[PDB]
Amino acid sequence: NENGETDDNIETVMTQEQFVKRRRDMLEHINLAMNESSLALEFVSLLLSSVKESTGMSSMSPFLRKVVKPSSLNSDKIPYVAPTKKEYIELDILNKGWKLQSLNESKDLLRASFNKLSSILQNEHDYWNKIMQSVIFKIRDRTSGQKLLAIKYGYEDSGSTYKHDRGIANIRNNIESQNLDLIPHGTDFVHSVKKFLRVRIFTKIESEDDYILSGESVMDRDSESEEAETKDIRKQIQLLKKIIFEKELMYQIKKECALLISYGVSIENENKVIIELPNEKFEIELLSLDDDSIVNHEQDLPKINDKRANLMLVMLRLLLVVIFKKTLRSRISSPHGLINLNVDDDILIIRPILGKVRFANYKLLLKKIIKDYVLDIVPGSSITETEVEREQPQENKNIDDENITKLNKEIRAFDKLLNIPRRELKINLPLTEHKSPNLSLMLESPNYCNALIHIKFSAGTEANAVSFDVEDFLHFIVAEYIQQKKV
Amino acid sequence: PYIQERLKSLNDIETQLCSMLQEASQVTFIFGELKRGNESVKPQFENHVKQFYERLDKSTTQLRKEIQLLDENVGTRALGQDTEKMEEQLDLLSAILDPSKSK
Amino acid sequence: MSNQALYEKLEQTRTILSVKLAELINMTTIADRNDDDEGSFAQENSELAVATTSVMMVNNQTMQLIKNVQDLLILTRSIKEKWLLNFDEKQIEELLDNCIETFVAEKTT
Amino acid sequence: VQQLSLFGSIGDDGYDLLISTLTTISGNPPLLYNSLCTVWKPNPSYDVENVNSRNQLVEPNRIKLSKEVPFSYLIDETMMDKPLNFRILKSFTNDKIPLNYAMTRNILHNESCSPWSLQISDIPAAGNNRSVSMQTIAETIILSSAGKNSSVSSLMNGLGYVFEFQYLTIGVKFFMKHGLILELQKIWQIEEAGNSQITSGGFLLKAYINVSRGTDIDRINYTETALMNLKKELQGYIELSVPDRQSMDSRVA
């Protein structure tokens, strides 16, 4: 209400000719009375008769050039009587009731358009009700630092640090709806144009036929139809959640950068494509320009690739909530703060780096190790794989905690999700009894590079043993093992 | 929040003030008829008249009272980081659950 | 603080009280009220200036009345503003993550 | 180490509010913590000069052993339970946790010993009007102990010190900008003849920054500023001031 009453009190208008002619009216119609008050200043020269009279006189430049003290009067106190006593004077006092009446008629008219002017202000009462229905960041912009323009609102990132261009800024339109400013991310009431993160996974098989690749993409579309109703901050709360998602895509920009540390696709410095060798497949995308920008026809068919692909997005998304979390571990925990993000691209690399690694590496390599263990497929034998390497390090949701009760909780939260981030290959073993021998091997991913380090002991009355830590040598070691096994 | 009540009490006091105007506007046009000698609605003139006085006295007590209340409320006693940090998981985790089995 | 802010509002209210009264009372004087009684102390003598009282009353009283209103609606909504100034928790999740991993990652056992 | 600091206080009344406020100013929650401090003086049976083999005027001072007590050794009721430190402090007001604190000084409940923070501080920097309390602290960490008499009490006696007095403090601390810490705290005297809360009535307020330098006038001057900004920002809500030096002198007294 106050703002709107202040708006009407800002003279403000965007009128062409309408606004123009009106102000010209003020100029001339005001000027007239200004000029006639100057006849009033000429009665001043009319005194003459005194030095202080001359002072008043010089009021006209023409008085400056019309030297005389000029005029003189006599006595008609009788004429004062006539002015007062005339039947005309009694009658003239009727001109007093008459003008005063028409002034009261004006007054009535003005008064009524006033309540109807308060009625356009009831549109605002409703807007405030709309705001009542449905961050208290306080800001000032347009520089100056004092006065200028000052207001308040919330934003997105908070605990843990992406770094650049991150926040939110919020103001109310005359349509009783709130416009969401961003202090960049440029305003468009509950946004203008939005990019969700998106994803997309291709597989190029053809049964190894013509190098035909198709994709499939796990799609995140709540709808294209948008509501976020005017006068409703509750709908704006929904728009604020949308804002959070937009801030999240900025996180996928960090993952883009974290790609830059790998040899899997980044082409021209203008687009980067996520992709991996086996069965040639591709998984997800978003150009070094951006992520997911909305404009397409909509039909529903799915596809096996598509179902898998929705699993990727949530993981990749999830994985950097981890980053968003182990950042805050350090922050909450120790003095300096965390600021400046992923040195050694050790912290960075986690996002999109360890998922790629995980899928591809351990798995393909394990498969390949298994064919090599088919080179030990020869003896009747037996051989088994566990999470045993996984069990031995990196336990999940443990009661132990860390330094503190407050600290302990967050540490624990990290740990169970930490399985996913840690995802090196577990490793395996094989054994024989009858005067008994034994051997064993561990597959280690170090960033999608694969080590296979093995062990072996033949337990008997007197002990003999060897342990060794490349796949070429592993093949050969297996051949040497056949000879020193039973055969 | 429950202050939205106190907010609506004042927004209504606002409508009371726009009535101080609406009412005294009649007082303007009605005293127009009255000094015009046509004693026609002299009782009705008195009515809407003590009514403009009444509306503004009610507004006067109501916003004066509201100011007293705000002083009383005053006498009475980043958020971003908190909920958001954790909640990350809650949405992505619940959604990862959703794509794994459903319906 | 709040006190100083209110004082202004109270003054505005007093102003609003004192001017519909001047519009009413000055109505009498504007309509012209020449008295056979010598004691009565309101004047409307000279032509222009005594009906000018009527032109000034219009702008003065009517804008002071409406103005007290505009200022008091500001006052109201100012106070309004003042007032608007203001899951699978567990390792259970470890299981969930393993599910997703096997799901997304390949091999059929 | 150099500890620049400002002090003040609030009645338990003000706590609730102050908390909500401090959380917003700092943007971190308050974090619950505690610590016991055991003070030692030179064995009054021995007697020593105030000079070195390097003719130096050296004054006798107290030693301060400090460490955390896990709350399990401190808290009166599970019913209260919960994680919230301020509502919990009302529970703690006027009177003691289990304590009898002697027990821990010599193990119990055949034993080695814990880690301690062994400190000795000097009177805050002489100053005609200081904007901030600036105090020097000599510290070493004891990691564990070994030998015949390995209880912390035996150790201190071996070094020629004697137990003087002790106190527990429980509070919340705020982690803040440029190493600024805010502790809202309560202190309890611990004696064998029972425990009393030194801070009964409210909370000791301490806003501080430990600086590694001392000899980097710049970082020292930066630190002054930090503290100033705080006192200033909260001015008209709570005054942070420099304590009387004389009142921070752990010497012989």
Side-chain angles (χ1 to χ4, degrees), chain A residues 4 33 40 56 62 70 79 82-83 97 112 145 150 154 159 167 169 184 186 215 228 258 264 278 302 309 335 337 352 355 360 379-380 393 413 421 430 437 446 451 459-460 463 465 479, chain B residues 1 24 32 37 43 75 78 80 95 99, chain C residues 5 22 31 39 42 49 51 105, chain D residues 1-98 102-253:
Chain D
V1 63
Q2 294 290 130
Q3 179 169 284
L4 289 69
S5 64
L6 296 170
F7 292 91
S9 66
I10 41 98
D12 317 313
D13 300 285
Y15 183 76
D16 316 338
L17 190 81
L18 172 60
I19 286 313
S20 297
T21 282
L22 281 190
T23 292
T24 304
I25 301 303
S26 62
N28 286 288
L31 307 174
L32 182 56
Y33 82 93
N34 71 64
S35 78
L36 171 78
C37 304
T38 77
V39 185
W40 308 71
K41 73 196 199 228
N43 198 309
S45 284
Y46 306 145
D47 282 328
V48 57
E49 347 66 67
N50 302 307
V51 63
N52 308 332
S53 50
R54 317 103 53 153
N55 207 289
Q56 282 177 208
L57 232 99
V58 177
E59 47 193 24
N61 208 336
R62 304 172 164 75
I63 276 66
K64 200 155 72 66
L65 263 39
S66 189
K67 77 159 180 140
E68 90 292 18
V69 196
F71 277 110
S72 79
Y73 291 127
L74 294 187
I75 311 182
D76 179 49
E77 183 181 302
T78 330
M79 182 256 170
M80 208 85 137
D81 193 346
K82 207 61 68 215
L84 181 276
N85 47 204
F86 311 87
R87 163 278 203 169
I88 71 129
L89 261 70
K90 173 80 182 283
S91 82
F92 292 100
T93 195
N94 262 96
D95 234 298
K96 255 79 163 189
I97 298 171
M103 61 200 195
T104 46
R105 292 173 186 177
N106 298 331
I107 329 147
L108 184 87
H109 258 243
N110 280 341
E111 338 86 302
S112 42
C113 79
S114 298
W116 288 92
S117 183
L118 190 153
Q119 293 170 27
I120 296 144
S121 63
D122 310 331
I123 189 176
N128 186 189
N129 155 80
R130 311 103 73 204
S131 68
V132 92
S133 172
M134 190 166 92
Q135 178 170 53
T136 307
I137 298 98
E139 164 196 298
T140 189
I141 268 47
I142 313 184
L143 302 155
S144 58
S145 67
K148 302 202 288 285
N149 322 302
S150 51
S151 85
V152 77
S153 192
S154 299
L155 298 172
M156 296 306 287
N157 285 175
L159 277 39
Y161 270 61
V162 160
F163 176 93
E164 185 168 20
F165 69 97
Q166 76 179 139
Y167 62 98
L168 166 79
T169 142
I170 302 173
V172 296
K173 63 202 289 184
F174 285 87
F175 283 107
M176 296 172 183
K177 306 159 173 165
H178 307 84
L180 171 60
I181 287 135
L182 253 161
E183 313 184 303
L184 260 175
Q185 37 163 291
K186 286 184 168 297
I187 302 166
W188 285 275
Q189 180 164 33
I190 301 182
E191 329 180 70
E192 322 281 38
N195 327 303
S196 55
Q197 184 182 150
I198 267 42
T199 55
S200 185
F203 293 80
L204 191 70
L205 188 70
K206 176 185 183 175
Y208 72 100
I209 296 156
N210 289 161
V211 309
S212 17
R213 303 311 320 156
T215 48
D216 184 320
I217 317 80
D218 295 297
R219 207 130 50 205
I220 272 15
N221 287 174
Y222 182 57
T223 306
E224 287 202 14
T225 298
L227 271 351
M228 290 308 288
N229 288 329
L230 184 57
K231 160 207 189 285
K232 190 78 265 294
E233 193 165 337
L234 310 168
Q235 190 212 30
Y237 178 38
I238 174 144
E239 73 128 28
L240 291 174
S241 64
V242 185
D244 191 323
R245 302 203 309 138
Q246 296 298 302
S247 298
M248 310 179 90
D249 186 5
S250 76
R251 206 198 321 261
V252 187

